[PDB]
Structure 1
Amino acid sequence: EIISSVLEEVKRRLETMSEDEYFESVKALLKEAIKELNEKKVRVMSNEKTLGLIASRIEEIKSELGDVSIELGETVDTMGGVIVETEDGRIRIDNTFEARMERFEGEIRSTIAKVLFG
């Protein structure tokens, strides 16, 4: 499967990624989700390492997004990225790497179409 094969490359890259570079991913995907939801109180779910980073570096996050209050939620089985929901649990944006790769599957197929047909 093409999704799983490209996620293997994401896995390889995470193998040597620094905490600081990974946190740039966390911040970017947090901001995207938080901005689309456009609410002042959200809950964030991710793997244990990621939630720990968000907790440790909350002030860095609030400087690039001052309106939001984050509460950590339950830890999940993800390679990385974040799931962000409203405090009440009504709306949820899945910004895990797994979900994001699925959503960008069309870009991979477009490249393959380029290879085959120009």
Structure 2
Amino acid sequence: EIISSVLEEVKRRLETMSEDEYFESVKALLKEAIKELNEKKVRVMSNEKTLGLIASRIEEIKSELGDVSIELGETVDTMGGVIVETEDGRIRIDNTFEARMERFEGEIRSTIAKVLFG
């Protein structure tokens, strides 16, 4: 439940976020996933808006990310972020805000521990 509540704060911040700021998130999460897969050709999935951004700014993405090839995949219901997989679909990395918040849960718990026990 704490994961859900923190994601509501994320969704509040996304409510006024400019496209340029959101794109910085897109590039960072894309790059991280692509580095991990260590492949030049990948398929990306996210919500409609995000895939539209990636398509619109592919030049900017290739400049900052190096020599990688991206193919849009199916749209998925997500608040943001990206799911990146090898072209053959064998390996998939989930970098959606929902999955990332779950993985960062430990950090929220460290904060709570500090509040309680210092």
In the alignment, the residues of structure 1 paired with residue 114 and residue 58 of structure 2 have an alpha-carbon distance, to the nearest angstrom, of: 43
In the alignment, the residues of structure 1 paired with residue 84 and residue 5 of structure 2 have an alpha-carbon distance, to the nearest angstrom, of: 26
After superposition, the CA RMSD in angstroms is 0.4
Give 1:65 shift: 1.5
TM-score, scaled relative to structure 1: 0.99
Give 1:100 shift: 0.1
In the alignment, the residues of structure 2 paired with residue 23 and residue 66 of structure 1 have an alpha-carbon distance, to the nearest angstrom, of: 17
Per-residue CA deviation, residues 10-34 of structure 1 (Å, 9 max, x unaligned), is 0000000000000000000000000
Query: Which consecutive segments of 4 or more residues in structure 1 shift more than 2 A?
Result: none
Per-residue CA deviation, residues 71-94 of structure 1 (Å, 9 max, x unaligned), is 000000000000000000000000
1:113 match: secondary structure: helix
| Residue segments in structure 1 that go unaligned for 5+ positions in a row | none
* Worse overlay, 9-18 or 60-69: 60-69
Q: Is the aligned partner of 1:117 residue 2:95? A: no
Per-residue CA deviation, residues 5-57 of structure 1 (Å, 9 max, x unaligned), is 00000000000000000000000000000001000100000000000000000
| Residue segments in structure 2 that go unaligned for 5+ positions in a row | none
Partner of 1:63: 63
1:64 match: secondary structure: helix
In the alignment, the residues of structure 1 paired with residue 80 and residue 59 of structure 2 have an alpha-carbon distance, to the nearest angstrom, of: 21
Give 1:67 shift: 1.7
Give 1:66 shift: 2.1
> What percent of counterpart residues are identical?
100
Give 1:116 shift: 0.3
In the alignment, the residues of structure 2 paired with residue 101 and residue 64 of structure 1 have an alpha-carbon distance, to the nearest angstrom, of: 25
